Design a binder for this molecule. Structure first.
Ligand code: MN
Length: 395
RNA sequence: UUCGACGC
RNA sequence: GUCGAAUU
């Protein structure tokens, strides 16, 4: 229903102009804390008007929308549009003392994006931009969205979902794997609060399909060990797994391993030894047109949650299957409503820009990682640190 | 790579 | 390549 921003304010969802005006008035839910109060802009068009306007917009929005005050932006010019010359300005910036780097790429050069991006994820919060894509017409839409994600990557919290703290899971784990070609894959596991904020993330190395279940288990254990070490008193009595991704087909073996992993985390006191949990498969299914937030039951274990398209009335359904749960027959229906509601609230959380993705954050954010992991691997960049664990570097 | 959507 | 980004 509403987004919680700063100073105790809440603004309706589904209205980006009201969210922006809200941030100008009250601030974000959390301003990032900075060490230098300095950010670098790195580019190769020193007399460019578009870059001039870009700098001045970033400067005024950072202060006025984001309430990050007195930041200095320093500029660094590179003079050849290739890896070693840009990297050299990047290095100059990092030696200067900066909280993050905004890097304007020159043209369209995919190997160069992945090479530079993998070096920076490893170093310092960064936000790329394309010189060719700038225009006066779209500059304000462009900077508005760009800063939602750069503020997050600097450790800020734009807005969180307003949810009933008595309803839903204590934590939600988005987990699964994504195949990056026909043989190789990586596992992921991400812990969320019910308010849609990411608490911790782990990704496995790239492995082969034969190694899927082995790394699925360990990646999930690492992410919970991580969450628990930085939240020792967060009791988990209600736990939900959101399983997603193009991964090997292996559903019974996979459910058995997920069940085992929760039984080991109980033994190790990472969750309650009487935790109530459900393991769910979330799958995007083919769109359709009515010629909603609606919950459809297809069988006692298969459900559909229908959502407007984030763009006849077009609908993007999300399939939801309960593959395992330890719920009582009595609790059952009630729990089904809560878990479906929660999936709907999470589908409204997106720190990539102002517009809702209408896809659950637990499904969406692992897709964003996958794109980077796949292409870094393909273009031979630097493989992707408690900093990367708590920060949404993939946005 | 601000992002999205279409068409091929 | 074709639009679009308060009001989805
Ligand atoms: Mn991004």
């Amino acid at each position: 229903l509403t987004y919680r921003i700063g100073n105790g304010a809440s603004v309706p969802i589904s209205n980006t102009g009201e969210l922006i005006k809200g941030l100008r008035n009250y601030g974000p839910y959390e301003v990032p804390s900075l060490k230098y109060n300095q950010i670098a802009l790195i580019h190769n068009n020193q007399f460019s008007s578009l870059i001039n306007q870009l700098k001045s917009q970033i400067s005024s929005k950072i202060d006025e929308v984001w309430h990050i005050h007195n930041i200095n932006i320093s500029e660094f010019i590179y003079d050849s549009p290739h890896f070693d010359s840009i990297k050299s300005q990047v290095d100059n910036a990092i030696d200067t003392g900066v909280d993050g780097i905004m890097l304007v790429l020159p043209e369209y050069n995919t190997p160069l994006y992945y090479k530079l991006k993998s070096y920076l994820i490893n170093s310092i919060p960064s936000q790329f931009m394309r010189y060719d894509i700038l225009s006066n017409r779209n500059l304000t839409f462009y900077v508005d969205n760009l800063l939602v994600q750069f503020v997050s990557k600097l450790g800020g919290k734009p807005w969180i979902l307003n949810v009933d703290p008595e309803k839903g899971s204590d934590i939600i784990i988005g987990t699964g794997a994504t195949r990056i070609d026909n043989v190789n894959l990586f596992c992921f596991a991400m812990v969320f609060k019910k308010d849609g904020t990411m608490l911790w993330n782990e990704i496995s190395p790239i492995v082969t399909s034969s190694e899927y279940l082995t790394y699925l288990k360990s990646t999930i254990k690492k992410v919970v060990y991580g969450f628990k070490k930085s939240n020792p008193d967060w009791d988990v009595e209600k736990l939900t797994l959101h399983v997603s991704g193009k991964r090997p087909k292996m559903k019974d073996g996979e459910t058995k391993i997920l069940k085992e992993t929760v039984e080991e985390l109980k033994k190790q006191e990472m969750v309650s030894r009487d935790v109530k949990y459900a393991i769910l498969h979330l799958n995007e299914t083919h769109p359709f047109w009515v010629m909603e937030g609606t919950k459809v039951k297809l069988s006692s274990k298969r459900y559909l949650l229908t959502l407007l398209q984030p763009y006849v009335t077009p609908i993007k359904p999300l399939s939801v299957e309960i593959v395992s749960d330890n719920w009582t027959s009595e609790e059952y229906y009630h729990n089904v409503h809560e878990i479906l509601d929660e999936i709907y609230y999470l589908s409204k959380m997106n720190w990539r820009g102002f517009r809702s993705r209408n896809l659950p954050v637990t499904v969406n954010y692992p897709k964003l990682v996958a794109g980077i992991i796949a292409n870094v691997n393909r273009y031979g960049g630097y493989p992707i640190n408690r900093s990367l664990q708590t920060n949404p570097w993939f946005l």
